[PDB]
A paper describes a structure:
We have identified a transporter from Syntrophobacter fumaroxidans (SfMCT) that shares 25 and 27% amino acid sequence identity, and 51 and 57% sequence similarity with the human SLC16 family L-lactate transporters MCT1 and MCT4. In summary, we reported two structures of the bacterial SLC16 homologue SfMCT in complex with the monocarboxylates TSA and L-lactate. We have presented the structures of an L-lactate transporter (SfMCT) with two different bound ligands.
The structure shows SfMCT in an outward-open conformation with a central, conical cavity open to the periplasmic side while the cytoplasmic side of SfMCT is closed. These two residues trap TSA by partly obstructing the ligand-binding site. The side chains of F359 (TM11) and C362 (TM11) are within a distance of <4 Å from the benzene ring of TSA interacting via hydrophobic interactions.
Numbering used by the authors: 7 to 41, 45 to 161, 167 to 200, 211 to 420
Write the structure that this text describes.
């Protein structure tokens, strides 16, 4: 049929499309304001909400009618989203074009490779997931310099939108699970089977993981935007604080592959719980390390490592608990937690800071959420593997 590393390249393409989506708004704040900063950020808020919710229908549709159709619809929708975002005049115009259309298309791109790629790597599920999610830490390294080039803004929307449409159409074009029979390899039994979606959705462990995903995502999104202002409040220059926090991008991208590889070799739960614990420690430690370039860098690298790991390790966990046949539907549901979090978290962090005027409230709230997540992730072990009596009774 085809070499099983191609779905990795596909997930990389799709997720890199998605990372470009996530990166664009940051470069658009100054150009758009040139023609309120909060008023712009509402478009990114809608983008995060629509993306995170639409993974759910994208996952159900991928499981029902295959991932090719969904990734390609998402590519057309996101391409239209960006290209129409270029021909805008109002704020509501941007909300619609970028927040809704683009978020819809991007979510439909994002989910199906995460579900599909591991099916090709039953030997390396987490690493395959990682390739399907690693593009989201690559948007900067590809788009950023060229973005600055073309700005020095409508052109960035139009041209990047075309490029993303093409990458998503290619990534979806060649994307599909392995054929039903053969799995890519190199007295009566007791036949088990993967969980159905209705069975997993009704499982309590699913909702404990859901809660842990919400906590981790919410903490990261509530503080990440504040790291550099923490540094400037401690006496650093804007440029020095900014340099320091920028290392976070490197660690956020690398963790998606590295954690996947690591938990493939040794297992998920304790490493994942360790990453959560370390994130909790970082939310507290910033008050001691955050006032110097080297210290603020260490905190940024740790936070990024932990945060990014979430997006390989939650699907890897979900895959371990319930199996791969319904991974589109199960992970589509579960990601809606990061959907709600990306909607509301950044706003909450800003509001707590303003309320007290200080970074104690958001950082300690985020440390509490990561503590809850540590407990949930560490104590939650996989559920009973299901018994397939309706197949078991075929053996004479
Ligand atoms: C934003 C953080 C909130 C995460 C936790 C949300 C709990 C929502 C309730 O879940 C319910 O649990 C039952 C079994 O436990 C299921 O049978 C039922 O179908 C499901 O609706
Ligand atoms: C900054 C912290 C980095 C993570 C270091 C913790 C690695 C955990 C290794 O323990 C292993 O975990 C597996 C279960 O998941 C099992 O094989 C077994 O219980 C144990 O051998
Ligand atoms: C002195 C004021 C209180 C400080 C310590 C408690 C912080 C309570 C803020 O609530 C926040 O609201 C979000 C709403 O979605 C939830 O995610 C979550 O429960 C929590 O992060
Ligand atoms: O990895 C993701 O998919 C993500 C989702 C929502 C917000 C930020 C990110 S970085
Ligand atoms: Hg957002
Ligand atoms: Hg988005
Ligand atoms: Hg976290
Ligand atoms: Hg999210
Ligand atoms: Hg708090
Ligand atoms: Hg909190
Ligand atoms: Hg809460």
């Amino acid at each position: 049929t085809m070499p099983r590393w191609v779905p990795l390249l596909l997930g990389l393409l799709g997720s890199t499309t998605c990372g470009m989506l996530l990166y664009a708004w940051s470069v658009f704040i100054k150009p758009l304001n040139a023609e309120s900063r909060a008023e712009i950020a509402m478009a990114f808020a809608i983008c995060c909400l629509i993306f995170g919710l639409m993974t759910f229908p994208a996952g159900r549709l991928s499981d029902k009618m295959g991932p090719r159709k969904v990734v390609m619809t998402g590519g057309v929708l996101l391409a239209i989203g960006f290209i129409l975002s270029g021909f805008i005049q109002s704020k509501y115009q941007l909300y619609i074009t970028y927040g809704v259309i683009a978020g819809f298309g991007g979510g439909m791109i994002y989910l199906p490779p995460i579900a599909t790629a591991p099916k090709w790597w039953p030997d390396r599920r987490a690493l395959a997931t990682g390739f399907a999610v690693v593009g989201l830490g690559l948007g900067s390294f590809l788009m950023g310099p060229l973005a600055t080039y073309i700005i020095e803004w409508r052109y960035v929307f139009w041209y990047c939108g075309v490029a993303m449409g093409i990458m998503a159409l290619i990534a979806g074009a060649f994307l599909e699970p392995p054929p039903a029979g053969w799995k890519p390899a190199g007295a009566a039994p007791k036949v088990t089977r993967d969980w159905t979606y209705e069975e997993a959705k009704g499982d309590t462990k699913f909702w404990l993981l859901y809660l842990a995903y919400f906590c981790g995502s919410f903490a990261g999104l509530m503080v990440i935007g504040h790291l550099a202002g923490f540094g400037r409040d401690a006496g650093l220059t804007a440029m020095a604080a900014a340099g320091a926090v920028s290392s976070l991008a490197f660690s956020n991208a690398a963790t998606r592959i590295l954690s996947g590889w690591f938990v493939d070799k040794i297992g998920i739960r304790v490493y994942f719980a360790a990453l959560f614990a370390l994130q909790t420690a970082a939310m507290i430690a910033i008050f001691q390390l955050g006032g110097s370039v080297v210290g603020l860098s260490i905190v940024a690298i740790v936070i990024g490592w932990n945060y990014g790991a979430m997006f390989t390790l939650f699907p890897a966990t979900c895959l371990q608990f319930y199996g791969p046949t319904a991974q589109g539907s199960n992970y589509g549901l579960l990601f809606t937690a990061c959907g709600l979090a990306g909607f509301a978290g950044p706003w909450v962090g800003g509001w707590l800071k303003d309320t007290t005027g200080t970074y104690y409230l958001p950082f300690l709230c985020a440390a509490a959420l990561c503590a809850l997540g540590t407990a949930i992730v560490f104590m939650t072990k996989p559920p009973e593997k299901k018994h397939a009596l309706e197949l078991e009774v075929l053996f004479q």
